[PDB]
Amino acid sequence: HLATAEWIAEPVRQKIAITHKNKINRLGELILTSESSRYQFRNLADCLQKIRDMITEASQKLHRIRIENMNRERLRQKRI
Amino acid sequence: KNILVRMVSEAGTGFCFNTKRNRLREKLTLLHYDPVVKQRVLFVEKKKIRSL
Amino acid sequence: LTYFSARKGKRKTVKAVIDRFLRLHCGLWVRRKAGYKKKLWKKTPARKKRLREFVFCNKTQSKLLDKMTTSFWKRRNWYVDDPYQKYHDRTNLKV
Amino acid sequence: EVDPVENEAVAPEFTNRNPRNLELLSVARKERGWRTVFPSREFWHRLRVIRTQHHVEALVEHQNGKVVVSASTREWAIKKHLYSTRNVVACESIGRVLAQRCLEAGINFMVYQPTPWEAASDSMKRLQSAMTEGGVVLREPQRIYE
Amino acid sequence: SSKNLGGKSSGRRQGIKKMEGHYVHAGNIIATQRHFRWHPGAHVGVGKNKCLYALEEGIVRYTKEVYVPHPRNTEAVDLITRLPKGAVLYKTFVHVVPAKPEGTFKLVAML
Amino acid sequence: RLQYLIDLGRVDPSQPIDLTQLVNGRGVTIQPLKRDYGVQLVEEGADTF
Amino acid sequence: RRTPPLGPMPNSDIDLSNLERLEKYRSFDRYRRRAEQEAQAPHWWRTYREYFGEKTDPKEKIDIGLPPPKVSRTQQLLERKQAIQELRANVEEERAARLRTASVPLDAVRAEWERTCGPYHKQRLAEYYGLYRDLFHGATFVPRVPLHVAYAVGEDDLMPVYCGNEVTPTEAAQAPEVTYEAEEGSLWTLLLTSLDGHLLEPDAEYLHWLLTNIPGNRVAEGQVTCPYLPPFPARGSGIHRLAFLLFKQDQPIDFSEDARPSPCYQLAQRTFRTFDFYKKHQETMTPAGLSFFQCRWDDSVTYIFHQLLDMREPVFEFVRPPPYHPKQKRFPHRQPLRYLDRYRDSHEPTYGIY
Amino acid sequence: QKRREREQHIAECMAKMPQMIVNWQQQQRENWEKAQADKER
RNA sequence: ACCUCGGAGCAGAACCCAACCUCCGAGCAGUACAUGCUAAGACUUCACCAGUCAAAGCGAACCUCAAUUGAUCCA
Ligand SMILES: [Mg+2]
Ligand SMILES: [Mg+2]
Ligand SMILES: [Mg+2]
Ligand SMILES: [Mg+2]
């Protein structure tokens, strides 16, 4: 549960919730899954390092969507 | 009439490519991709290996 | 080759085969392509990469090299950091 | 046991039927090949301009041959404001009107396949400038082959 | 005597490797040719020895289509621009009709 | 392999296990003449160890 | 052995006797126009069009729309010729055309385009977007009433919904503002449906709005038989299509078997098939307008999915079919080591019985 | 020490490099200019 | 006299096809300097060796030609 995560500070608990919404369930839990090895010890290591990199990074196709959004503005220019 | 010539990178990498030039031409200087610096750098002719 | 030596009465290896080829434990033989360090200024880059590949051998050539080497060269070898440790076995191979 | 909602019944495969779907996602095939003839058919949409003796027609066409959006001087729409229907002004104004129709149809990218004399003509330069400054990008994004 | 020498080259083993209606995978050579006998059509790439390969997985289909050359192939435009009016040249093109959908939309979560 | 040997009682876990206990319990065969330098412990079966 | 041709040969009716007294094409362009005309000709040989084109039925797509507006061609043509005469009589117009400094007013152009050929251009856009195929199963109607739809975004902003432009669910959270130019005494029906968007049935759509028995342009006094639910395209499902349909009613219609509940947030009740709708009520009204937009996933959709529809948010991903890789051989004769890596399953070391 | 010396020599060469590029390129464009001069003759 | 390589006929239409059979050529030249790297799938001169084409990807940009050639060891 990212909200009740006292081991994470609040400034960064909130940046993670806006940076990893695609990984937050409706129960407010951050979910991490690793399947790149046949040893659950190595998969758990990958998941824990993913959490650690989330905290560190919080502490510190795009061309298509950019042009589509820009042309969405040349039409939403409809002022009243 | 033509010659094979070793061209050595001036990036200090030690990369070396071999190409051909007419003998009655001057020493070749080229822009070639050195993959050690991952960039297109100057190469200058440092030896004649044979006649092709 | 020598099928029975004169000092030990045993079969001998062809050290030419040993100095040229690599045997994987699965029974496959690996070689380099002929002319990979020759006249490269006339070779195109696709051909040069093709020559730089490590390629396998025939069934006929494999049986021939297995006959020209002794059973010491077919044992399983547990080297420290062998780059062919993956290829020493077959996976998902049907018939 | 937890009673399931009669709403959360989703099929294991979504079936989007929008013709534009995989093309706006960049994951759709472009018709490669035809590399001994002209024009190329490796595009999703294309701008094709037809300059007849009297009129100028510009169309945005799918690779199917289906025509998406079009602008011609044969319309009274463009006729009642132009002096002439075959001038550099005609090509420019058709460029502006189709650019507007493309933006409202959602067509933001297309291929333009010119001929060298069309490319070096000044009517087509004013049309491409009109489309580019009206919002239409005249190079299509590449396919995410993987 | 016999002052004719050479001529001892073997056959190139060229021609069609995948006839009509055969299933083909991406990369498979459909034909090999010294001259452009069969032309690249839909989803069929051409390699620099004029060889024809399948760009998509599908079914090889031969057709006869019209021939409009690139307006930079000086040789072919010169013929087209001397051709009589009402005359459309045709050639034999090879097409791969692709067999599988580019992909499917599957459920991956229930977030 | 180590867990299987321990469970079948061929290697005593209550004593320090060394190469001698692993060749006496006959879980590894070492050939110093084939340039064997001993035993390497590998990760297989770390999840049920 | 030879077989005679099954029909006319292509370059057959060209007289090969007077080849030097026959006219030639001296232009790549002129050859190209003839080439493409033959290319679109039917032809009795095997064709790219035969193997790749869409072979729809020649059922001659049935019109289901309000009759075409009647105009007087002679008076219209006379007015247009006189107007062009005045425009060319202006000297400054000729100056601007020769100096290439002229311009054309896009707003006026768009207004009378909406009046003149906009209906047919919209019909072609709908057919390209496949809305008739999926709403009316092939039947086509010329949109003869301009249905202006916009979304109130910000305080002074509107995002219009023309003919397939993208509108985000953040911009489509609340109901749109609609305007159809009508006369008094004409009852109407406005409908919003998401064609692509049903999460269970692949054939069905989702009803979003069913304003019925509507006074006239007045869009606030029509029975709200189904309330606006904002579009909800799932994440990774791609671009969905959402169509606002406007039908002109003759008699006042009783909509009691198509009356969705009040705070209706159940998708099994929000399933809709416009073919069944228009079939059961065909003899009462006729389609008149069509405004459509394209919708993708946005953060607001997590809200619609979680709070409004009491459900977990569906997430989908495009998966591409796996690679071919022919049957593996015991002796892969001239292949590299990457072969054995192609048939390998796991990248980590295995040890077998050791 | 050998690795540091190699990387530092590479660093000095790549530090001097862009200026080398611009004046070699001006010599090349210049060589085009004399070539066009003797082809104007 | 010939011995290796390529094009045409014999060998008319998938492939292949011999003669001290009939003809013609090759043992390069030009350009480039990403003529970088890598990697699915294929072709194949009737074996092997050798030879050929190539999607996707990384990095950049925004090859002509028909043959035009020589293994291993060793230097
Ligand atoms: Mg011959
Ligand atoms: Mg022969
Ligand atoms: Mg073969
Ligand atoms: Mg590529």
Instruction: Give chain D's domains with CATH numbers.
Output: 9-146 (3.30.420.80)
- In DSSP notation, A17-39 reads HHH-GGGB-TTS-B-----SSS-
Phi/psi for G88 (5° steps) reads -75, -25
What letter would DSSP give residue D141?
Answer: P
Dihedral of CA B17/B19/B23/B28: which sign? negative
Per CB-CB distance under 8 Å, the chain C contacts of G343 are 91-93
Q: What is the largest CA-CA distance in chain E?
A: 90
Domain range enclosing E37: 5-111
- In DSSP notation, G310-334 reads -SPPPEEEEEPPPP--PPP-SS-TT
Chains with ≥3 Cβ pairs under 8 A against A?
D, E, F, G
User: Which of G149, G204, G140, G144 is CA-nearest to residue G172?
Assistant: G149
Task: Report the chain F residue with the minimal C-alpha distance to residue C73.
Answer: F34
User: Which of A1, A3, A4, A16 is CA-nearest to residue A59?
Assistant: A16
Tell me the one-letter amino acid at C44.
T
Q: Domain containing E109 — which CATH number?
A: 2.40.50.100
Q: Residue B45 class from Cβ within 10 Å (0-12 exposed, 13-18 middle, 19+ buried)?
A: middle
Domain range enclosing G161: 122-308
- In DSSP notation, chain C reads --SS-SSS------HHHHHH-EE-TTS-EEEEPTTSSS-TTSS-HHHHHHHHSEEE--HHHHHHHHHHS-GGGGS----SS-TTTTTTS--S---
Give the CA dihedral A62, A65, A71, A72, nearest 10 degrees: -140
Q: Which two tokens stand for residue C40?
A: 């490269």
| Contact (CB<8Å) C87/G335 | no
The whole-angstrom separation of Cα G171 and Cα G149 is 13
Residue G101's alpha-carbon distances to A42, D92, D135, G89, G110, in angstroms, are 70, 11, 21, 18, 21
E39 contacts: CB under 8 Å, gap ≥ 6: D36, D37, E65, E67, E91, E92, E93, E94
CB-based contact F44:F22 (threshold 8 Å): no
Q: Which two tokens stand for residue C84?
A: 């062919």
CB-based contact C49:C33 (threshold 8 Å): no
What letter would DSSP give residue G229?
Answer: P
CATH class for the region spanning B1-52: mainly beta
Per CB-CB distance under 8 Å, the chain G contacts of A73 are none
CB-based contact D45:D109 (threshold 8 Å): yes
Dihedral of CA G75/G81/G82/G83: which sign? positive
Asked whether residue C33, judged by its CB, lies under 7 Å from any atom of the DNA or RNA strand I, the reply is: yes
What letter would DSSP give residue G24?
Answer: B
Rg (chain E; Cα; Å): 20
Tally of domains within chain E: 1
Q: Domain containing A35 — which CATH number?
A: 3.30.160.20
CB-based contact C23:C69 (threshold 8 Å): yes
Residue written as tokens 């072969």? Answer: G339
Give the CA dihedral G181, G183, G184, G189, nearest 10 degrees: -50
Asked whether residue E37, judged by its CB, lies under 7 Å from any atom of the DNA or RNA strand I, the reply is: no
Rg (chain C; Cα; Å): 16
> What resolution in angstroms, rounded to 1 decimal?
2.9
Rg (chain B; Cα; Å): 11
Ordered by start, the domain boundaries in chain B are 1-52
Residue written as tokens 């902003």? Answer: G157
CB-based contact G240:G294 (threshold 8 Å): yes
CB-based contact D131:D98 (threshold 8 Å): yes
Domain range enclosing A35: 1-60
Which nucleotide comes closest to B7 if you measure CA to C1'? I33
The whole-angstrom separation of Cα D132 and Cα D47 is 12
> What are the beta bridge partners of residue G295?
G240
C-alpha G9: how far from chain center: 39
CB-based contact G291:G160 (threshold 8 Å): no
The whole-angstrom separation of Cα B51 and Cα G262 is 91
State, as a whole number of angstroms, the distance between the CA of F21 and the C1' of I44. 59
Helix (H, G, I), strand (E, B) or coil at F41: coil
Asked whether residue E27, judged by its CB, lies under 7 Å from any atom of the DNA or RNA strand I, the reply is: yes
D vs G: CB pairs below 8 A: 155
Q: Which is it for strands D111-112 and D45-51: parallel, antiparallel or unpaired?
A: parallel
> What are the beta bridge partners of residue G193?
G207, G243
Neighbours of E65 (CB within 10 A): 24
Which nucleotide comes closest to G328 if you measure CA to C1'? I41
State, as a whole number of angstroms, the distance between the CA of C27 and the C1' of I54. 30
Q: Residue H19 class from Cβ within 10 Å (0-12 exposed, 13-18 middle, 19+ buried)?
A: exposed
Q: What share of chain B is helix, strand, coil (3-state, %, to 5)?
A: 0, 65, 35
Phi/psi for G178 (5° steps) reads -115, 150
The whole-angstrom separation of Cα D135 and Cα D138 is 9
Per CB-CB distance under 8 Å, the chain C contacts of G341 are 86
CB-based contact G120:G68 (threshold 8 Å): no
Per CB-CB distance under 8 Å, the chain B contacts of C41 are 4, 18, 20, 52
User: Which of G206, G225, G217, G272 is CA-nearest to residue G246?
Assistant: G217
The whole-angstrom separation of Cα E23 and Cα E98 is 10
G148 contacts: CB under 8 Å, gap ≥ 6: G160, G178, G179, G180, G291
The whole-angstrom separation of Cα D10 and Cα G316 is 11
- 45-64 of chain C touching strand I, CB 7 A cut-off: 45-52, 55, 57-58, 61
Tally of domains within chain A: 1
| Contact (CB<8Å) D108/A61 | no
CA distance G335 to chain C (A): 5
Q: What share of chain D is helix, strand, coil (3-state, %, to 5)?
A: 30, 20, 50
C8 contacts: CB under 8 Å, gap ≥ 6: none
Q: Which nucleotides of I are covered by protein (CB under 7 A)?
A: 1-9, 11, 13-26, 29-46, 48-57, 59-60, 63-64, 68-72
B52 interfaces chain C, CB cutoff of 8 Å? yes
CB-based contact C70:C12 (threshold 8 Å): yes
- In DSSP notation, G118-186 reads HHHHHHHHHHHTTHHHHHTTT-B----S-EEEEEEETTTEEEE--EEEE--TTTTSSPPEEEE---TT-
| Helical spans, DSSP H, in chain A | 10-19, 40-59, 62-73
Residue G178's alpha-carbon distances to D15, F22, G168, H20, in angstroms, are 30, 85, 18, 66
A37 interfaces chain F, CB cutoff of 8 Å? no
Q: Residue G275 class from Cβ within 10 Å (0-12 exposed, 13-18 middle, 19+ buried)?
A: middle
Name the residue closest to the C1' of I25 by its CA.
Answer: E6
Tell me the one-letter amino acid at G215.
P
